[PDB]
């Protein structure tokens, strides 16, 4: 009676979606065929026969990565009307994923979401998995967040945006494909979770002792975080928190709604020994600078509204005991106007392991979702990567030729520059 | 007295090759009357891509241009030229000294 | 889907095509007959990008062969992998090459052009989603410069929204095999920066030294130089027809590369380039497959990368490797080559990784440079045009076909900007 | 409820700590695995599973000696993040353990100590094992005692310095490295115990009859002395003495805090017969001129504040009897201002023999500590070994080239010369 | 970690190294191919100091082989352990040796200097913690004195904060195999006190008397002289690549040793040196492996240690022994020889003990002295300069390449202080 659905726009959302839907079948005994040997109705509109198809719409412009799904192990799971493909990709071009080619199949996408809201009576929210890199994942979501607010408007719309790193970038027009996706979705997003590609490599290197992490392994860490946010629907816990409740505790203004996730503990199999990982210990591992999955220095700002999503055998006294240590500490300075900014959710499931993953089986976990202040310097970075590449008019001739104007680039920067004034608007102290 | 640790990094990491040959031959004769001053540091555009921007001395005075004088607070990191691998090596220091030779500014 | 047409023109192009469709057809496991014998089923999942299924389970290449004499077309037909082609494609003339740009574009190019395009149209109606037109010519000769720079201006008249990518062989600095190649080049550069998208400018002079130093051969035949070019040629499109962990195609390798609509002249590269006996000394790891790439000895275009700077840099890999080893090494070399990149382009390493290595190796790297290092390629050619135009030597053949004296200054006026802009966009800062 | 961590800076500190942590696992039945078939909470932050990891931080710059630990018998024992290595050693150079390499990994060390004291509610003291020889053992300690006096300040900070021998020295800049590390640690050390190599070679020859003593065998004697100081926490006796109770009895003036250890009886296995070793016999063996573990003549001075730490089956009547025999003797002269200067502790544990060691199993032991007078004549030794190498200015060109001023060498000598005056300030008779 | 580069220059240097890498290969158990066959796993724990692992579990040396003619490099490549090296390292020239400091530094040293250092730069990028640079040359010739004294003045331009330890065979008093070796050494002494850190002055003269009296041979070939030198050359570094009790390394063998930044000329030593049959008469104990050392017959540098005194005397012991027996003997020989040490250096013995003896022994001693005994090495050489400069004979060859008559007086003025400083700090008391 509470059903959330998921959309997989681009490729970086689709291969993360291969890590999510593999993982849900382990937490419920679901086969890849949909067979199983009662609260899993939040993701699976079932059939009168034995099969549990998922609630997922895989839209893609190029037919490349979808054919790995149509031929892989989870071929039999999905309904083959969900698996929507096309002919030519946007190819890192906002004007080929929002104006030219993305205009074509948009009436096959929304009409497919139309036939999934009728299998639901308690429709809950949206899960668009995408990235800010390409012009498909950040050029078609910007089209599609406009459309699902025309359809509903009053439903929660959660993204999981894979963030462009300050160290490593595998594109060239990537600071053009991020300023354009802000302006289009900022008036119709709900709460976009930032996850960085860079910071997972350090967590795979130091805390896990993996020197060769593949894209198979950077998505296992984003699999458990998405499994932790939606852990309160599929299971009964001590203090549950539904998806409609995230938009009020975490979003202080109609602009600042960019939380960065953080999972803990992350340990190797050999280091499951040698330590005990108490809730008073693993909570201090949340607020380290060395464990944040978006590369900033969190001791260079504040914290407007944190949020802790515990799970496993966790004592709610020791939660209060571990938190009362934290607000007494020195380095972790919250915001003056926020009195005390936590929203703690204790659930009754251990963090389940996937076979083949290099994560130890621990008895408890936490997915901190910290709306910090200091990430605006990382928003200040992707304007300095805009200004130097726009005074020389570099790479503009691909956008102009496919339906995009010159007037809409210094426009959205000033809109982004208005979003950068708002974080220093937070950092003031309105005294007396 | 670290003339060798900076001239090696002038023509291998910051201004190397045939492109800026006219540029780095300027900054040899500029410091010829200098280097009796003990230490000299450079400014670096970014810790990821080290490009040369300004040449300093340690007395912080610019001779070939950013700011004419620096403070300790606007310094991002303190980098050490790894001679064995022609790269940068970060430090835990916040003050100056014999160890530091490469500084990066903030914004 | 995403079908590509492969047109061949000139003698130099038509002997890569005997080797290219041997480079390709050994990856997909294609016999000299035209059938399939490979083991993996990943090959036939994307066989239709270059092929057509015929009756009996046979696959034939989508290639269209153009010449002005039946000389070299008889060699490719009589050669191995020659009977794989569709025999209607072989469109050839009678008057010979002429080694003459004024003949292959104004005299013989004006007769056989419509008998080419109707076979092109027959090959394009059999394709659902047309991608682009990879064309194999060379700037040196007269067949592949008069006819090869005509199909640019005729097929883009028919297909104005596809990708046009030529695979050209550029004249060398030291040795010259044509006396009028300072006239065949400048008449073609005028036609390339009109209606193309990219051009993999490959030299011969740097291609010999790699066969001497790095490959360590003794007698390099053209069967071992085109063996090295066509190895690089398949690596560009191998992410368009095989599953990769980070996908690229012939538009992602078009938008990410080209910063301005004229500066689109590339320079390839490849790794590993072992020796026959020195394949037991170097470790085959991603930090070793990159340090071989960013040295100047590996650049097949005969210029120095340390002269001039880079604008955008691609690095298409193959094989099965890990994305941290890639992303560490793409950071690591940009530290130690920081002065060789340009300032107003940050994060200037485009990177893609496929998952199918070449048949027999373990991993391989295809480099796609784009630099201001090729400013003294055009400075070299447009000077050889200058001294040969003062005394107006060799002019009584092009003028004899009816070509005007101003048009040679017109094409020289076009290259006058293009030399300046690699200087103009070098020291322009912000 | 009481915890005392142990840090092993250097190499000579660590190789003793290879023999120390061998002994505690004998005194508690612990395997090298951390398995075992409320007395051991002082050295084992135990896990809820079966493993008792020690509270140890092994830090050294050169990665040679630590790889013996990571491959030895006690591989599985330690928490592997504790074992901290580096690349280039200090190599007997003070300006490479405090200015060049010591600044590199000081933040991996202190943050690792930071994650140990949070597992401690009753934190008691420090045990920094370091020798005065190298520029790691006396250049990284002097950096580290500055830093841990910033974090804690009030806590007790015990060290164990392997003294430079008066006739035998296996280094050339060793009379430099003692004056350097004194000046830095004298304002922040607590009670620095001097143990000499040369006297342990004497005891291995005469009282043990071993003609080939290896560093396997010169560390078993220091392993018993370190164990008997920390024997009152781990056990329970008729009169116990905690580690904070050392620094008040033993340090009269805040400069003179350099006592020398002495263990007794040290007998061979064949000499366990032929004698009786009574509680009034072994205490006369404590105050011999021969049986002291620093090669000095104790009859060339006085005794400011002795200490006796017995263990085993000891009756407190005869302790009062054997002490009363001692102050009536001729040669032993206490200082005139100290009325009676003893501080006696009795435990209920015999000293445990280690297999392979050539020490005989006895019923009782004594770990004599004595803040004596005449050790400053051996401090006068390490300035005549300084003045002859500072006048001709030898070896200075390695210090100056690695971040070290010239003015900090006659400065620290005068501070060492001020330490020489205070012992002669003690020995006077302030009459009337 | 702590990798070491092993550059080889000159004919004398390139024939020790062919024997030197035969020594290192037998302590770690290395075949001629490159694989592993040893029994102990302690050998591979620090294998990465001289080696780079290649594919298939094969180790190759980190050696860079510099030459001016292809003569001697043909002998090493055709000889055994020739195929262990990497075939890109063999950097050689064409114009012969020359036996000429004006040719190995001004004529052929000007061209082949960057073909060396680019291979040096390729070896250093494959190293994590770069330790130092051991160079195998000889003061006598003209390849190992012009080219070998150029690389120090180019690598310290590139690596100013490392250690540069050269292994120089020094000319003998009686026999002289070069007439102008009094010109070769005094031009090389000018280039080692500038930019080195230590220099093992090994002679030929005293090396035969060890091979005649102590070893009791009849016909000493160079295959047995360099057999004896390389046994010392591997002993200095075995406290870095094997676990020891009281450790030492190349920087601990720098700060302990060198009192002043110019007096860094060391003299080697080794024990035991048995006869073939007289190994059954002498006891193999540490008090016998010390009295063999501190006598003058064991010194490989041909000078009398009793003339002049010592400054810092280190003695790296090896094998399984006990530290009391060590420190008893290092005290005993300082009591009985106290007049041969200097007054103002107290406690003047550095001592190291490792645990892996050579294959077949039980314990071994490597002695690294330092003395004022080599005032009459420089009193010998600088006078042979002097009588060959009053008439200024042999000058019309070095001047012929462009060298000035003051530059010979500059290098002679450099040695004029260095003779005085072993006299200035000899009787300086306090
Ligand atoms: C059956 C047996 O034990 O034979 C011994 C042996 O009899 C004696 C006589 C050897 C032998 O040495 C000689 O005959 C000799 C000849 C010319 C020059 C120098 C030595 C031996 O050849 C040498 C050899 O030494 C080694 O193997 C060391 O590892 C040595 N290796 C080499 O020198 C070497 C020789 C050939 C090829 C490659 C390496 C070494 C020493 C220091 C550092 C590294 C390596 C040894 C113990 C033996 C023999 C075989 C007879 C002695 O020498 C050494 C260096 O060990 C000479 O006095 C010692 C005492 C040894 O007992
Ligand atoms: N988390 C995650 N990110 C990935 C993976 N593969 C690629 N990426 C990221 O994807 C980003 C590029 O955007 P993509 O989504 O792959 O591209 P696209 O949306 O399909 O658009 P085009 O490729 O231009 O058609 C880069 O920043 C990569 O870091 C993966 O397996 N997991
Ligand atoms: N008691 C004892 N002393 C030792 C032992 N090993 C070495 N030493 C002493 O250590 C002193 C040398 O200092 P070290 O601590 O070993 O050197 P270091 O501080 O590690 O620094 P490096 O010089 O870089 O190795 C000498 O006086 C030795 O007697 C040992 O096992 N036991
Ligand atoms: N790489 C390569 N270059 C070739 C080959 N054949 C000819 N060329 C080059 O092509 C140029 C001559 O042009 P060519 O194509 O034969 O003349 P055309 O037939 O009139 O186009 C010269 O620079 C030749 O070096 C070949 O097989 N491989
Ligand atoms: N110990 C030793 N000395 C050698 C050897 N070969 C040559 N020498 C000495 O090297 C000197 C001649 O120098 P050489 O290196 O051959 O000349 P270069 O090639 O110009 O450097 C003479 O003193 C020779 O005795 C050898 O194998 N061993
Ligand atoms: Mg895509
Ligand atoms: Mg040490």
Author numbering:
A (entry chain A), D (entry chain C): 1 to 37, 47 to 441
B (entry chain W): 634 to 692, 732 to 737, 739 to 780
C (entry chain H), E (entry chain G): 1 to 44, 47 to 360, 369 to 440
Text of the article:
We also investigated the CKK domain from Naegleria gruberi (NgCKK), which does not show minus-end binding preference. While the structures of mammalian CKK domains have previously been determined, our NgCKK reconstructions now reveal the near-atomic resolution structure of a non-mammalian CKK domain. It has a typical CKK fold, but sequence differences compared to HsCKK are reflected in structural differences in several loop regions. The NgCKK N-terminus forms an ordered density that is associated with the surface of β2-tubulin, although the density was not sufficiently defined to allow accurate modelling. Furthermore, there is no clear contact between NgCKK and the β1-tubulin CTT. However, NgCKK MT binding is shifted relative to HsCKK, resulting in a modified interaction with tubulin including even smaller contacts with α-tubulin, contrary to our previous prediction. Indeed, the overall NgCKK footprint is smaller on both α1- and α2-tubulin compared to HsCKK. Superposition of a single tubulin dimer from each of the 13- and 14-protofilament atomic models for NgCKK and HsCKK reconstructions shows that the interprotofilament lateral angle in 14- compared to 13-protofilament MTs is ~2˚ shallower. In response, NgCKK is only slightly altered in its binding site on 14-protofilament MTs, but HsCKK experiences a larger displacement out of the interprotofilament cleft on 14-protofilament MTs. Intriguingly—and in contrast to the HsCKK—the intrinsic protofilament skew in both 13- and 14-protofilament MTs was unperturbed by NgCKK binding.
